[PDB]
Amino acid sequence: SKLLELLRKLLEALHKAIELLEKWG
Amino acid sequence: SKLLELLRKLLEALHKAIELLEKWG
Amino acid sequence: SKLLELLRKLLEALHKAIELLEKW
Amino acid sequence: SKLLELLRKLLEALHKAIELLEKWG
């Protein structure tokens, strides 16, 4: 459960980073 | 990217299902 | 009963998604 | 520049997390 939760949060962080990159660049 | 996005959405679905199972029952 | 089955199907779907990563 | 650095590190973490998931899941 902890690894899956880690993965979920990390994928969500990646998604936000990509969204930022798209906006500011 | 498409497969990672699928995985994120699936993990988010799983998390909601677990929250529901904690609430009801 | 329906919620437990839903959880099982979701976990089965996740298992398939992980098998795809191993290939590609 | 730093945002691309952030992205690169998050992707490297993701690679490691997926490897852990594959070995034990």
Measured CA to CA, the distance from residue D11 to residue D5 in angstroms comes to 10
What is the 3-class SS of B1-25, one letter each residue? CHHHHHHHHHHHHHHHHHHHHHHCC
The amino acid at A11: L
C-beta atoms of D6 and A24 within 8 A: no
Could you give the C-alpha distances from D4 to A7, A25, B18, in angstroms and in order?
Answer: 20, 10, 34
**With contacts defined as CB-CB under 8 Å, which chain C residues touch B24?**
3
Tally C-beta pairs within 8 A across C and D. Answer: 6
C22 touches chain D (CB under 8 A): yes
Measured CA to CA, the distance from residue D10 to residue D15 in angstroms comes to 9
A10 and D13 Cβ atoms separated by less than 8 Å: yes
The residues in C 1-20 lying below 8 A from B, measured between CB atoms, are: 3-4, 6-7, 10-11, 13-14, 17, 20
Q: Is the dihedral of CA B5, A19, A22, D5 positive or negative?
A: negative
Resolution in A: 2.0
User: Which tokens in the block code for residue A4?
Assistant: 């899956």
Residue of A nearest to D14 (CA): A10
A24 and D3 Cβ atoms separated by less than 8 Å: yes
